[PDB]
Amino acid sequence: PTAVQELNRICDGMILSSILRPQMVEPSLIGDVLKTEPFTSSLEVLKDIKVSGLMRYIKQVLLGRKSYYKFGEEHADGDQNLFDYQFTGTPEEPIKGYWTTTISYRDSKPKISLTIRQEFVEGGVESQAVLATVVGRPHLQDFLLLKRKHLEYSDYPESIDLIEFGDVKVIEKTVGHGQPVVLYMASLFPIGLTKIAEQGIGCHNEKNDATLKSLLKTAILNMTPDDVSLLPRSKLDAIDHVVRNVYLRFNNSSAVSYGLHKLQSFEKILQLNGRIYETKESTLVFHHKKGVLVEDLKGLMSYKTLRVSEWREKQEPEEARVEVLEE
Amino acid sequence: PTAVQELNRICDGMILSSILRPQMVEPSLIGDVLKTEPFTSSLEVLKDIKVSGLMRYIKQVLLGRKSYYKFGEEHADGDQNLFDYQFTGTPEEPIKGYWTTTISYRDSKPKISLTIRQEFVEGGVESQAVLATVVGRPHLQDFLLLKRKHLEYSDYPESIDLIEFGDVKVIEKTVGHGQPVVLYMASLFPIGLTKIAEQGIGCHNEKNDATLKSLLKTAILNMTPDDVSLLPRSKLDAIDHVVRNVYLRFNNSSAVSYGLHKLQSFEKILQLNGRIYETKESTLVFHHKKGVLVEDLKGLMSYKTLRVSEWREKQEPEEARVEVLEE
Numbered sequence A, B: 001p002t003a004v005q006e007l008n009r010i011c012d013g014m015i016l017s018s019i020l021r022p023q024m025v026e027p028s029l030i031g032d033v034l035k036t037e038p039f040t041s042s043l044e045v046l047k048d049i050k051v052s053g054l055m056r057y058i059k060q061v062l063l064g065r066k067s068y069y070k071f072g073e074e075h076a077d078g079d080q081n082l083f084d085y086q087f088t089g090t091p092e093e094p095i096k097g098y099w100t101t102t103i104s105y106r107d108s109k110p111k112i113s114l115t116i117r118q119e120f121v122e123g124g125v126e127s128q129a130v131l132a133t134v135v136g137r138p139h140l141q142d143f144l145l146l147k148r149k150h151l152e153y154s155d156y157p158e159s160i161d162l163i164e165f166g167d168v169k170v171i172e173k174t175v176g177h178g179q180p181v182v183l184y185m186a187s188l189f190p191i192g193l194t195k196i197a198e199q200g201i202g203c204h205n206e207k208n209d210a211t212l213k214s215l216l217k218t219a220i221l222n223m224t225p226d227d228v229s230l231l232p233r234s235k236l237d238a239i240d241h242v243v244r245n246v247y248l249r250f251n252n253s254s255a256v257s258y259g260l261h262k263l264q265s266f267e268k269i270l271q272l273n274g275r276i277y278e279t280k281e282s283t284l285v286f287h288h289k290k291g292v293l294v295e296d297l298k299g300l301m302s303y304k305t306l307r308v309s310e311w312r313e314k315q316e317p318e319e320a321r322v323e324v325l326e327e
């Protein structure tokens, strides 16, 4: 288990400890994680490798830091002439009907990027462009720079040349001001702010995957329906962050068997956060009246315009009748 | 208005003219497109615009290139220290349990990439890697570079570290020898290899999108079923390239209305090219016995293991009976 993999595993343990109760990101937290799960590589190795986020704060506590994590401490302008190029979908292979391209200033945190999403519509392509950036930046100059890079990157499509700065949805993130932060439900709550920063959940080995599913059910179990009706919107969004990540780890039969949807306190969470949950298999609706429902284009019922049927356990008599079609 | 929009439309004019009539890619072809889509900007601003493909060939002709396009002239190793990142799903958010990443050398043509597709299965992670590259490359050494970049990029390098070069499928494309090419159905036919080089289809504006769709239908309409059975494989694959792009532009209702699938000669295209077509909305199967079928996990038919049901147009009286559920 290298130094990175151990760093990954300690971050897993902090995320898992965030499920049952909020915890301030400070060295004691990392210390409790090291109990059942120590750091076995050398501290000298750790002084070499460079990581970011909470794994860097794990590294610094392993290297003796006694102060708590300070929101905004990672701030960085990035290199204005080094760009990162990433994309999902293409015009020839779009994904869920869309293709999206994001170009950003390398090593910028918060990340200063221009994302251009596109789809085929009647009359050609519609584009939706988002400039994710920081308060006070030269937005127009930034846009015009990242736009050029989009044009040069994708062989100058007409559709991108047509996007004006006035077409661009601008999102200004604030840098922290050094607020201490609380980790709860895989999300950071900076003290003094109302927003959260959702963190990557991790938990990709079998053991931590099974722990994550266990802890979430127990966490919800540890709330009364009144407890849920009292939570701030920010903790609810935090819980949403974890719930949706868990259900993407199940097929429909496992998800229903998991049983989190059957709990009273979770029904109160469904009223505040929504009933529609993607899974590994498709999408379920945990409805308070109809029961468990499953996405189904042949559905006689609709939930927020999603066609659904009653999810029932797949039994072999339905599949024996599946008509194999001539090629 | 502008030079980029003009270049695109000269490029669209070639792609569109190629649907019905094959033509050598040489400067006289761009001359005759300039009749319908002139170039009003100055050659001096033309010289800053960086393009590839036919867009760059047009630019070169406008700047006075009088030689014909030579297959393989765009071949470039790329920068082995600059990388592009394509992802389809995520370890945090997989798509139907899968996530795929492709990392490639920036500006490599043919593209040299390593594609790792990964799934969460019972217990661990199954990976499949493909190295798409060029005849003659240092395959192992390219794999090890691209695998490193995949380890640095991954939210889960543990599952990547175990993939060995013996586990990786290699596809090698060949570079051209300077052959002249014919453009037909948006594809280059080098004289006289047996393969084609599919070209990107632009047509991002109202005029060229609508005409792209009417020409493809006109092309098929003006072949009988006997004409289609006499098409070589390379011409079948070119038609396939225009058919599949066109159907990515419609939702399912629009794809069906377009009616290309009702032409008897298209039924012969279907037998020879496949029945499964991706649209903007779903996957459709143009079946010869059952009609238009739509991918449907809960369908009672299967086409080549694809679960499907009969596609059904929205009818207001039926939509009126859909039980709208309470939120």
Ligand SMILES: CN1CN([C@@H]2O[C@H](COP(=O)(O)OP(=O)(O)OP(=O)(O)O)[C@@H](O)[C@H]2O)c2nc(N)[nH]c(=O)c21
Pocket: A202, A203, A204, A205, A206, A209, A248, A249, A250, A251, A254, A280, B091, B092, B094, B097, B120, B121, B122, B123, B124
């Ligand atoms: C680590 N895991 C595990 N997992 C899901 O959880 C299951 C893993 O297999 P498993 O349930 O542990 O096997 P097991 O219960 O012992 O036997 P069975 O075959 O009956 O399920 C799979 O259905 C897989 O989709 C995951 N799903 C997502 N989205 N991300 C993840 O990191 C993980």
